Write a protein that binds this ligand. Structure first.
Ligand SMILES: *[C@@H]1O[C@H](CO)[C@H](O)[C@H](O[C@@H]2O[C@H](CO)[C@@H](O[C@@H]3O[C@H](CS(=O)(=O)O)[C@H](O)[C@H](O[C@H]4O[C@H](CO[C@H]5O[C@H](CO)[C@@H](O)[C@H](O)[C@@H]5O)[C@@H](O)[C@H](O[C@H]5O[C@H](CO)[C@@H](O)[C@H](O)[C@@H]5O)[C@@H]4O)[C@H]3O[C@@H]3O[C@H]([C@H](O)CO)[C@H](O)[C@H](O)[C@H]3O)[C@H](O)[C@H]2O)[C@H]1O
Ligand SMILES: *[C@@H]1O[C@H](CO)[C@H](O)[C@H](O[C@@H]2O[C@H](CO)[C@@H](O[C@@H]3O[C@H](CS(=O)(=O)O)[C@H](O)[C@H](O[C@H]4O[C@H](CO[C@H]5O[C@H](CO)[C@@H](O)[C@H](O)[C@@H]5O)[C@@H](O)[C@H](O[C@H]5O[C@H](CO)[C@@H](O)[C@H](O)[C@@H]5O)[C@@H]4O)[C@H]3O[C@@H]3O[C@H]([C@H](O)CO)[C@H](O)[C@H](O)[C@H]3O)[C@H](O)[C@H]2O)[C@H]1O
Ligand SMILES: *[C@@H]1O[C@H](CO)[C@H](O)[C@H](O[C@@H]2O[C@H](CO)[C@@H](O[C@@H]3O[C@H](CS(=O)(=O)O)[C@H](O)[C@H](O[C@H]4O[C@H](CO[C@H]5O[C@H](CO)[C@@H](O)[C@H](O)[C@@H]5O)[C@@H](O)[C@H](O[C@H]5O[C@H](CO)[C@@H](O)[C@H](O)[C@@H]5O)[C@@H]4O)[C@H]3O[C@@H]3O[C@H]([C@H](O)CO)[C@H](O)[C@H](O)[C@H]3O)[C@H](O)[C@H]2O)[C@H]1O
Ligand SMILES: *[C@@H]1O[C@H](CO)[C@H](O)[C@H](O[C@@H]2O[C@H](CO)[C@@H](O[C@@H]3O[C@H](CS(=O)(=O)O)[C@H](O)[C@H](O[C@H]4O[C@H](CO[C@H]5O[C@H](CO)[C@@H](O)[C@H](O)[C@@H]5O)[C@@H](O)[C@H](O[C@H]5O[C@H](CO)[C@@H](O)[C@H](O)[C@@H]5O)[C@@H]4O)[C@H]3O[C@@H]3O[C@H]([C@H](O)CO)[C@H](O)[C@H](O)[C@H]3O)[C@H](O)[C@H]2O)[C@H]1O
Ligand SMILES: *[C@@H]1O[C@H](CO)[C@H](O)[C@H](O[C@@H]2O[C@H](CO)[C@@H](O[C@@H]3O[C@H](CS(=O)(=O)O)[C@H](O)[C@H](O[C@H]4O[C@H](CO[C@H]5O[C@H](CO)[C@@H](O)[C@H](O)[C@@H]5O)[C@@H](O)[C@H](O[C@H]5O[C@H](CO)[C@@H](O)[C@H](O)[C@@H]5O)[C@@H]4O)[C@H]3O[C@@H]3O[C@H]([C@H](O)CO)[C@H](O)[C@H](O)[C@H]3O)[C@H](O)[C@H]2O)[C@H]1O
Ligand SMILES: *[C@@H]1O[C@H](CO)[C@H](O)[C@H](O[C@@H]2O[C@H](CO)[C@@H](O[C@@H]3O[C@H](CS(=O)(=O)O)[C@H](O)[C@H](O[C@H]4O[C@H](CO[C@H]5O[C@H](CO)[C@@H](O)[C@H](O)[C@@H]5O)[C@@H](O)[C@H](O[C@H]5O[C@H](CO)[C@@H](O)[C@H](O)[C@@H]5O)[C@@H]4O)[C@H]3O[C@@H]3O[C@H]([C@H](O)CO)[C@H](O)[C@H](O)[C@H]3O)[C@H](O)[C@H]2O)[C@H]1O
Ligand SMILES: *[C@@H]1O[C@H](CO)[C@H](O)[C@H](O[C@@H]2O[C@H](CO)[C@@H](O[C@@H]3O[C@H](CS(=O)(=O)O)[C@H](O)[C@H](O[C@H]4O[C@H](CO[C@H]5O[C@H](CO)[C@@H](O)[C@H](O)[C@@H]5O)[C@@H](O)[C@H](O[C@H]5O[C@H](CO)[C@@H](O)[C@H](O)[C@@H]5O)[C@@H]4O)[C@H]3O[C@@H]3O[C@H]([C@H](O)CO)[C@H](O)[C@H](O)[C@H]3O)[C@H](O)[C@H]2O)[C@H]1O
Lengths: 135, 135, 135, 67, 135
């Protein structure tokens, strides 16, 4: 009798270990994706505007998917920080897509202590910095 | 008595499980091989002929092992689709082996609607495309 | 008893899988070598002779290791197609090695329909084309 | 083991034996830096392009020239 | 009884194998680091002195971290073979760091048989040769 009953108990234990292992693996098998992007970008800064002109890109991406951050200055548009938003890009505009041939103008404001030589900015896509004016 | 008899039964069951597992593994341990090939190939297309000239290759391979496929045209030789066959390669010919220094001429025919600008072809070896004229 | 016997069977199976894998890898770990060569070569063609003059090379190599192929003409020497052989290079000759300062003369014959403007040739080493008169 | 050819040494089929390895020879041990030369013979119908061979140790194939 | 006891023994064996494997891996996971360095160096040799002038370097490094070796001559300073040591570099000296703009003078002695045309030297950092006067 007893060697067969002991075998049935060990099968029951084995299934719970396998079910446990499956939940451990689930912490590895997510959140990996191709996030690399690369663009030819040129820029010019003035007391009132930043100009951004794109010559080429690795892929065609929405101007709403790109986040812009700034130091030494402030944006004249206050709703948020996507490139489409601060640049005043309408959905019908040619500049709705970030690719070679797209140009943007961003309006900015400086304090009494701030100066043009102190201003810099960065473009971020999927958590990677794709451009930095101070490079 | 009974604990020993129960043990003999469990050994008999164990052998059949091991024999079962061996047949499961046989579905994994076959059909893996090194099929990669790479060649410097140049080509010119005309209303009557395709010319193919080889400058180098990763390995030396038989011209009968390479399959050719075509669109926008048709072959003048109708027996099949190996490179040796459609190019009229005899077994004594220098061009029996695909390597740097081997040249081939393939004769072709166009319909009333077909034109030279529409023709393209590919070379396939061991199920991989090794050249494509429209790349 | 049975969990230990099952373990011994799984070790026996494991060794055969490892031995199988070793024979799969053997199809990758051969036939890779540095075959690149590069030479400064100049040439002149006439109704009777091809002249080939070498100014520099990436390495010093035997004139018997180089294969020559021709179109629009034929060689006067019929034994084979190595450069040393068709050029009549003796083992004591200065031109036994292909390097800067080595010169070769190859004798050729044309049919009633062939002409000097139609002749061309190539030099091949380790399956790569190293010179082509029609480039 | 060999196909498409034959060994010039006929006593057997161990690597040491067909290669003519003496017990004092450097090549008595199979390791990095060991080199062997095996002499062979071809028939009137056999050719170099047809020859291939394999090395076997403890019943496993460890090398195959036709891989 | 016995299938559970056999399972407890196999767990005990498993832990010792895992502990063994951990000590095998420790032979791989050490002694890998970025040791590459690259410098623009120029030098002049005389019957009494070697002059060494640095124009640029990949990184800024201590003159005590660089080892110098010589042939065809001997150093006038006998304590050792670091660059700082044989060149007489004090800790306050500008030339304490190896970078563009650092210059060194090393005093040397020749035998009755030695001559200036026979002298050469090398600079070594982290086991890599970074300069060789006879290149
Ligand atoms: C699983 O597999 C599937 C199949 O392959 C998918 O691949 C999935 O991946 C997800 O897919 C969903 C659906 O495509 C994605 O959700 C979209 O997310 C984008 C953001 S993104 O940066 O552009 O990539 C948008 O938010 C998009 O929304 C569209 O629709 C919005 C609402 O429009 C709807 O309602 C109006 C009426 O108000 C209708 O006229 C219209 O037809 C539609 O029904 C739009 O506002 C939006 O415009 C702007 O959106 C963002 C800002 O939010 C901006 O970045 C864009 O550039 C654009 O200017 C856009 O047109 C999402 O699509 C879904 O749409 C449904 C809607 O019901 C239609 O089905 C929802 O209402 C939501 O809007 C939204 O879920 C998701 O991102 C992918 O992960 C795999 O996971
Ligand atoms: C992506 O693609 C899109 C689409 O192609 C854009 O091109 C985007 O780049 C943006 O382009 C816009 C448009 O040029 C830029 O916005 C302008 O900034 C200029 C200054 S500039 O020196 O001329 O170059 C202007 O300020 C312009 O606005 C005009 O409108 C102002 C407000 O007028 C509005 O309101 C009145 C009522 O009060 C209405 O009657 C009128 O119709 C209009 O709706 C005017 O004050 C302004 O006059 C003076 O402006 C400046 C001083 O600020 C001065 O330098 C000028 O010479 C001029 O004398 C001018 O007439 C801005 O355009 C936007 O206009 C909207 C308005 O709602 C209409 O849409 C806003 O009110 C803001 O005024 C402004 O956003 C933008 O900066 C670029 O990013 C590409 O990236
Ligand atoms: C690999 O390596 C091999 C070996 O080196 C090849 O080089 C291969 O490349 C192939 O080369 C062959 C040979 O050149 C190519 O085939 C020829 O195509 C030409 C056209 S071309 O413009 O001259 O360049 C010819 O069509 C040539 O055929 C000749 O033969 C035709 C038929 O004659 C046969 O039958 C008669 C009886 O009717 C016999 O008396 C005769 O002896 C022969 O057996 C002739 O019609 C033809 O005359 C005219 O041809 C064309 C018009 O089509 C015209 O442009 C010419 O100016 C000429 O006036 C010519 O005399 C083709 O060669 C093959 O010949 C065989 C024949 O059986 C002998 O073997 C076939 O019958 C076909 O005619 C043809 O396949 C080939 O295209 C290349 O792939 C390398 O890749
Ligand atoms: C690498 O390095 C090597 C070594 O340095 C070579 O330099 C090689 O380049 C080769 O050089 C040789 C030698 O020059 C070239 O071969 C010659 O081609 C010339 C033609 S040319 O216009 O003068 O330049 C000659 O044909 C020369 O042969 C002579 O020999 C012929 C045969 O004579 C032989 O047989 C008779 C018996 O019948 C013997 O008595 C005699 O001793 C000899 O063994 C003669 O016919 C020939 O006379 C006429 O030749 C031509 C017409 O073809 C005419 O233009 C001349 O003006 C002359 O009146 C001449 O006396 C070729 O040299 C080789 O000679 C051997 C012979 O066995 C001796 O070795 C062969 O029999 C061939 O005749 C021939 O191969 C070669 O072409 C270059 O590749 C570098 O690349
Ligand atoms: C492991 O490590 C060991 C030890 O280091 C080996 O290196 C082994 O590799 C083997 O090496 C041997 C030695 O090189 C190879 O055997 C030789 O094959 C060559 C041919 S080759 O082209 O020169 O490379 C020779 O055949 C050589 O034999 C010589 O001996 C022949 C017979 O002479 C014997 O008998 C006469 C009496 O008749 C005696 O006087 C003499 O002293 C000797 O005992 C000669 O015929 C031969 O002359 C010609 O040989 C060939 C033609 O076959 C020709 O190409 C040559 O240019 C030359 O003109 C030459 O003098 C082989 O060596 C062995 O010699 C023994 C002999 O008993 C002495 O030990 C046998 O009789 C055989 O002749 C032969 O086995 C071997 O192939 C490699 O495997 C590493 O793997
Ligand atoms: C683990 O993680 C840590 C934290 O990140 C480290 O990264 C560690 O890496 C090791 O760090 C230690 C400590 O930094 C390194 O040891 C130094 O090795 C260098 C050699 S190196 O080529 O310059 O790179 C030096 O030997 C250095 O010593 C300094 O101190 C010496 C003694 O000075 C002490 O005593 C005097 C009184 O006599 C005091 O006034 C002084 O304040 C100090 O307490 C100096 O002689 C020495 O000068 C010269 O040293 C070398 C020649 O030996 C020469 O090449 C230099 O250019 C320089 O001219 C230098 O100033 C080591 O630092 C440690 O200092 C302690 C001391 O107690 C202070 O803490 C010891 O006494 C030893 O001197 C020494 O261990 C080690 O190389 C790194 O691997 C990670 O592994
Ligand atoms: C890194 O950065 C550092 C700091 O900037 C250095 O620049 C280093 O390069 C080194 O520079 C030093 C300094 O120039 C070089 O050493 C000198 O070699 C010259 C020869 S040279 O042709 O003039 O160019 C000198 O030999 C010089 O020494 C002087 O001192 C000698 C000894 O005098 C000492 O002892 C006496 C007592 O006997 C004291 O009174 C005196 O104060 C001093 O302490 C003198 O003999 C010498 O006179 C003659 O020297 C030569 C012949 O050898 C002759 O050509 C001259 O024209 C002159 O007539 C001269 O006055 C060396 O400097 C060091 O001096 C120390 C001394 O202890 C003081 O510190 C040693 O004793 C040695 O003499 C010597 O090391 C060095 O070669 C460079 O590597 C950068 O790489």
């Amino acid at each position: 009798v007893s060697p067969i009953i002991a075998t049935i108990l060990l099968i029951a234990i084995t299934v719970v270990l396998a079910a446990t292992l499956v939940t451990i693996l689930g912490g590895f098998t997510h959140g990996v994706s191709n996030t690399v992007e690369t663009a030819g970008v040129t820029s010019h800064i003035t007391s009132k505007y930043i100009f951004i002109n794109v010559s080429s890109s690795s892929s065609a991406i929405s101007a709403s998917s790109i986040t812009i951050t700034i130091t030494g200055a402030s944006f004249k548009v206050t709703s948020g920080d996507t490139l489409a938003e601060v640049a005043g890009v309408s959905s019908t505009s040619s500049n709705a897509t970030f690719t070679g041939g797209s140009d943007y103008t961003v309006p900015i404001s400086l304090s009494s202590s701030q100066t043009v030589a102190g201003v810099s900015f960065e473009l971020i896509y999927k958590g990677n910095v794709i451009y930095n004016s101070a490079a």
